[PDB]
Amino acid sequence: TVHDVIIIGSGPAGYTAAIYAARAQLKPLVFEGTQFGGALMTTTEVENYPGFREGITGPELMDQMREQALRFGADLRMEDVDAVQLEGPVKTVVVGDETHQARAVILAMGAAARHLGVPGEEALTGMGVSTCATCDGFFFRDQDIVVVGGGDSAMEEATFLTRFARSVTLIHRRDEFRASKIMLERARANEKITFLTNTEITQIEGDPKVTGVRLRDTVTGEESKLDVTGVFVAIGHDPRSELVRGQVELDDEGYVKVQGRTTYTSLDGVFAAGDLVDHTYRQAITAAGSGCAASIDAERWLAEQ
């Protein structure tokens, strides 16, 4: 059995690709992963996804898309793909001890936000801990918050957040910032931002919501506590391209390269969408858009065979 299309991933990109491929009668086979639903599964209210005047929670939205894919005939499997063979007319995915094959594959594995790895981080996510100033900065009006990271992203997150927060404490493990000079001088100039170099978070305190962070100096080991009600983590993202490394061309940061404004990868019959590709916008609505394009690309490519 060789399917027309296999989709790997179950965030907005993968489910939108599945909706379009199923409605196009391609009977898509979708491997959602055991941690299915993408990054919105791990948040609370999603307010900037167009179409919901009153907002919708992450899991509610993601279950709408999943049922929508099912309604049109997508075959959804809550299983991880463990290995892929993507070269040639027939592509293979390996799921545990099972194999499945298709003529086209849409890569929609997304990107992981890098975590601090400290107690409280996971429990308090969507409850004071966030990775996305565009998404949640709204909710921290007149509050004291922290941003963690030393790059352009953390610089941009911290400066953006000062239009809501009472104050922004920018925390970084070293005393060198890898951010660009222009980005660095911007938040230096911002009066609502204070830098803490050579500082790490060791724990996030929070009754139901974030109440404080425990800090440690990476040089002296001196510890203290900071009272804050938000923690924005901006220490980078890792595209989930491990499956395809050595098969599809990646950029220096591991994102899947695509041709022009399309979803075509370096391999014939292989298409990529969502935050696996995009290191610029990283929103549900942009990932959904690109999942639609991947399905249209794949359909047109299949027609040319």
Ligand X SMILES: Cc1cc2nc3c(=O)[nH]c(=O)nc-3n(C[C@H](O)[C@H](O)[C@H](O)COP(=O)(O)OP(=O)(O)OC[C@H]3O[C@@H](n4cnc5c(N)ncnc54)[C@H](O)[C@@H]3O)c2cc1C
Ligand Y SMILES: Nc1nsc2ncccc12
Could you give the CA distance from residue 40 to residue 52 in angstroms, rounded to a whole number? 15
Measured from the CB atom, the residue of 109 and 135 that comes closer to a copy of itself is 135
Q: Rule CB under 8 A: say whether 261 interacts with a copy of itself.
A: yes
Beta strands in 154-245 (DSSP E): 167-171, 193-196, 199-206, 210-217, 223-227, 230-233, 237-239
Nearer to ligand X, 14 or 177 (CB): 14
Nearest Cα residue to 62 out of 7, 14, 107: 14
Tokens of 145: 């918050």
**Minimum CB separation from a copy of itself for residue 216, in Å?**
32
Applying CB under 8 A, among 45, 86, 140, 156 the residue interacting with a copy of itself is 156
Furthest C-alpha separation in the chain:
65
135 catalytic? Reply is: yes
Q: Which is nearer to ligand X, 212 or 274 (CB)?
A: 274
- What Cα–Cα distance (Å) separates residue 192 from each residue in 129, 181, 279? 20, 19, 27
User: Is 140 one of the binding residues for a copy of itself (CB under 8 A)?
Assistant: no
Q: Does 241 bind ligand X (CB under 6 A)?
A: no
**Integer CA distances (angstroms), 34 to 31, 91, 272, in order:** 9, 22, 20
Active site residue 136: yes
Q: Candidates 49-57, 76-84, 205-213, 239-247: pick the segment binding a copy of itself (CB under 8 A).
A: 49-57
135 binding ligand X? (CB under 6 A): yes
Which of 4, 63, 75, 80 contacts ligand X by CB under 6 A? Answer: 80
Catalytic residue at 292?
no
Q: Smaller CB distance to a copy of itself: residue 106 or 293?
A: 293
Nearer residue to ligand X within complex by CB, 196 or 285: 285
Question: 5, 26, 43, 229: which one contacts ligand X (CB under 6 A)?
Answer: 43
Burial 181-203 (b: 16+ CB within 10 A, else e): eebbebbeebebbebbbbbbbeb
Q: Which 158-177 residues touch a copy of itself, going by CB under 8 A? A: 159-160, 163-164
**The one among 34, 220, 280, 305 contacting a copy of itself by CB under 8 A:** 280
Under the criterion CB under 8 A, does residue 16 sit at the interface with a copy of itself?
yes
* Structure-derived torsion over alpha carbons of residues 250, 33, 3, 293, reported in degrees to the nearest 10: -50
Residues 6+ apart with CB under 8 A from 46: 40, 52, 55, 56, 57, 58, 61, 135, 284
99 binds ligand X (CB under 6 A): no
Contact 242, 107 (CB under 8 A): no
Residue 41: which region, alpha, beta or left (left: phi > 0; alpha: psi -120 to 50)? alpha
Q: 187 — phi, psi (to 5°)?
A: -75, -30
Instruction: Give the residue among 117, 152, 110, 121 at the shortest CA–CA distance from 232.
Output: 121
What is the set of active-site residues? 132, 135-136
User: What residues make contact with ligand X under the rule CB under 6 A?
Assistant: 8-14, 31-33, 35-40, 42-43, 46, 48-49, 80-81, 108-111, 113, 125, 130-132, 135, 240, 243, 274-276, 282-285, 287
User: What residues make contact with a copy of itself under the rule CB under 8 A?
Assistant: 12, 15-16, 19-20, 23-25, 47-54, 56, 61, 64-65, 67-68, 71-72, 134, 138, 156, 159-160, 163-164, 182, 186, 261-262, 278, 280-281, 283, 285-293, 296, 299-300, 303-304
User: What residues make contact with ligand Y under the rule CB under 6 A?
Assistant: 116, 118, 148, 171, 173, 200-201, 235
